[PDB]
C-alpha cells in the first residue's frame, strides 16, 4: 500500500466520538468495549506487551516514543514497592482537543485501557490526571468509573482474574506544564508542578517513589482495541514505523473545525479538504499550517502540498507532529501577531524552574512584541534565532524546545516578511 487516507468507519477504534451514542456501560458493551477482557487478563503481561510491540503503536502525547518499548521498561519484578500506570489527561496543547473527546464520550474505553495497561506491566492502581478545567469531563468519567466498580469489572478481582486494580482521578489546577510527564508526577504528589530531571526515569522512580508509566489517553484507550482486533490489524495501517490511526484536531481558519479519526499517513491537503470543508477562501487562500499543536514549527503552503501527517514525513519536513493538531492560518492572518500570542502563552504557561526557559521565553516574547509592531532592526532576527538555539537542548523538559520551535519555524519560513515589516516600521515611524 502506498495510497493512504480515506479511512473506513468499520476500522475506526473510536466509535461514539461525537456523542451520538450512549456513553454509559450498557451502551459501552453495545459498542464492543469491556468484551472478552478476562481472556486478555489471563494471557499474562508478556502477551499484551507483545501485541503492543507488534502493533507499532507510538506515543500520542507529544513525544512520539514507541509505546511497547516504553511499557517494557516496567516489566521487572517488584522489591516491596508497587507500580502505577498513570494516564496523562491534561491536554493543555493549543489546537489539541482530542483527549477531552475521549474522556467525555468514551470513558469506559479509557477505563478498560487503564486496566489492560496496568495488567501489561503489573501496575497496582491507576491515576487519571485530568485537567482541572475539564470538570464536566471529570464528573462524566467518575460516573463511568462508578459504573465500572458497580459491575465487578475493576476493583477487587477485576473481571474474574484475581488481579486487584484501582482507578483514581486527580484533577489539575490550571497549569500547562502539568501535561509533561515528570511535572505530572510532581503534581500528583501535592507540590509545585515542576518537572523532574531524567535520570531517574519514571520507569525506575516515578510517582511517590514507585515505578510509574505516564501514558496519554489516546495511546492507552486504543490498546484493548489493539488486543481484541489484532496487532497486525493495527500495524496494517500507515507507513512503516508510523502505524495506527490518529484523532486529528483541525481548527483555526477552516470552514468546519473538527475532531476526526484518520489513518496515520494521510496527506494534509486531503485531510483538510475532506474532513473540514476546506480552508476559508479555498486552498489558494492558505498561508501556513501549524501542523501538530503549538510546540511544532509551522509549514507554509508549499510544504502543505505533498506532506504526510505522520512522524517521519514531518521530520523530513523539519517539523514535528506530536498531538496532531492542524491549526490553519489563511492569508488574512497576521502570522507574527499569532506567533507572538503563542509565545505569550508559553511565558504565561511555564513553571519557571531552570534559567534558559525562565529567561528566554520572556525575552523572546519581548522581542516578538517588538516584531509585531516592527520596533527593531533586521540584525535582531538571527540573534533571536541564537536565542532559540540557546534554549533548545539546554532545558529540563521540552517546553523550552516547544517554545523555541515556533520562533525557529516562523523565522526560517517567513524571514522576508519580518524584514518588510521592520522596514515599513522604519519608514512610517521615523
Amino acid at each position: 500500500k502506498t495510497s493512504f487516507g480515506s479511512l473506513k468507519d468499520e476500522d475506526r477504534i473510536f466509535t461514539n466520538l461525537y456523542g451520538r451514542h450512549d456513553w454509559r456501560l450498557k451502551g459501552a458493551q453495545s459498542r464492543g468495549d469491556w468484551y472478552k477482557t478476562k481472556e486478555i487478563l489471563l494471557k499474562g503481561p508478556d502477551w499484551i506487551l507483545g501485541e503492543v510491540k507488534t502493533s507499532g503503536l507510538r506515543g500520542r502525547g507529544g513525544a512520539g516514543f514507541p509505546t511497547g518499548l516504553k511499557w517494557s521498561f516496567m516489566n521487572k519484578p517488584s522489591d516491596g514497592r508497587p507500580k502505577y500506570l498513570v494516564v496523562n489527561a491534561d491536554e493543555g496543547e493549543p489546537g489539541t482537543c482530542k483527549d477531552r473527546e475521549i474522556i467525555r464520550h468514551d470513558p469506559h474505553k479509557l477505563v478498560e485501557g487503564c486496566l489492560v495497561g496496568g495488567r501489561a506491566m503489573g501496575a497496582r492502581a491507576a491515576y487519571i490526571y485530568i485537567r482541572g478545567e475539564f470538570y464536566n469531563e471529570a464528573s462524566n468519567l467518575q460516573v463511568a468509573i462508578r459504573e465500572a466498580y458497580e459491575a465487578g469489572l475493576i476493583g477487587k478481582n477485576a473481571c474474574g482474574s484475581g488481579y486487584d486494580f484501582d482507578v483514581f482521578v486527580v484533577r489539575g489546577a490550571g497549569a500547562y506544564i502539568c501535561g509533561e510527564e515528570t511535572a505530572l508526577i510532581e503534581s500528583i504528589e501535592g507540590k509545585q508542578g515542576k518537572p523532574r530531571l531524567k535520570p531517574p526515569f519514571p520507569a525506575d522512580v516515578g510517582v511517590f517513589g514507585c515505578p510509574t508509566t505516564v501514558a496519554n489517553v489516546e495511546t492507552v484507550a486504543v490498546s484493548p482495541t489493539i488486543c481484541r482486533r489484532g496487532g497486525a490489524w493495527f500495524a496494517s495501517f500507515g507507513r512503516e514505523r508510523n502505524s495506527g490511526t490518529k484523532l486529528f484536531n483541525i481548527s483555526g481558519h477552516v470552514n468546519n473545525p473538527c475532531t476526526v479519526e484518520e489513518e496515520m499517513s494521510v496527506p494534509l491537503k486531503e485531510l483538510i479538504e475532506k474532513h473540514a470543508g476546506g480552508v476559508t477562501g479555498g486552498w489558494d487562500n492558505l498561508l501556513a499550517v501549524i501542523p501538530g499543536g503549538s510546540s511544532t514549527p509551522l509549514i507554509p503552503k508549499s510544504v502543505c502540498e505533498t506532506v504526510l501527517m505522520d512522524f517521519d514525513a514531518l521530520i523530513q519536513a523539519q517539523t514535528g507532529l506530536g498531538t496532531a493538531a492542524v491549526i490553519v492560518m489563511d492569508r488574512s492572518t497576521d502570522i507574527v501577531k499569532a506567533i507572538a500570542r503563542l509565545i505569550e502563552f508559553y511565558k504565561h504557561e511555564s513553571c519557571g524552574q531552570c534559567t534558559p526557559c525562565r529567561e528566554g521565553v520572556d525575552w523572546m516574547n519581548k522581542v516578538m512584541a517588538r516584531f509585531v509592531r516592527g520596533d527593531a532592526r533586521p540584525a535582531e532576527i538571527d540573534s533571536l534565532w541564537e536565542i532559540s538555539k540557546q534554549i533548545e537542548g539546554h532545558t529540563i523538559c521540552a517546553l523550552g524546545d516547544g517554545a523555541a520551535w515556533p520562533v525557529q519555524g516562523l523565522i526560517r519560513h517567513f524571514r522576508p516578511e519580518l524584514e518588510e515589516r521592520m522596514q515599513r516600521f522604519a519608514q512610517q515611524h521615523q
Binding site: 540584525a379 535582531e380 538571527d382 540573534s383 534565532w385 541564537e386
Partner: protein, 55 residues
C-alpha cells in the same frame, strides 16, 4: 607675524631662510578649542549575531 617689514627683512637675511611661511608661534590656523560632539565607531565584535566568545 606683527613685525614690520624692515625687521622682517633683516630677520630673513640674518637667518638666511624664509621665516614667515613657517612660524613656530601659533595663530588662527589651529583647531578651535570648542569641538563638535564626536560619535566614535564601535569595535568589530559589537554584533548581536555570531558573538560566541569561544570563537
Amino acid at each position: 607675524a606683527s613685525a614690520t617689514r624692515l625687521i622682517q627683512g633683516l630677520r630673513n637675511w640674518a637667518s638666511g631662510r624664509d621665516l614667515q611661511a613657517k612660524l613656530q608661534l601659533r595663530y588662527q590656523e589651529i583647531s578651535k578649542r570648542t569641538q563638535p560632539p564626536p560619535k566614535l565607531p564601535v569595535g568589530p565584535s559589537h554584533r548581536l549575531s555570531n558573538n560566541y566568545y569561544c570563537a
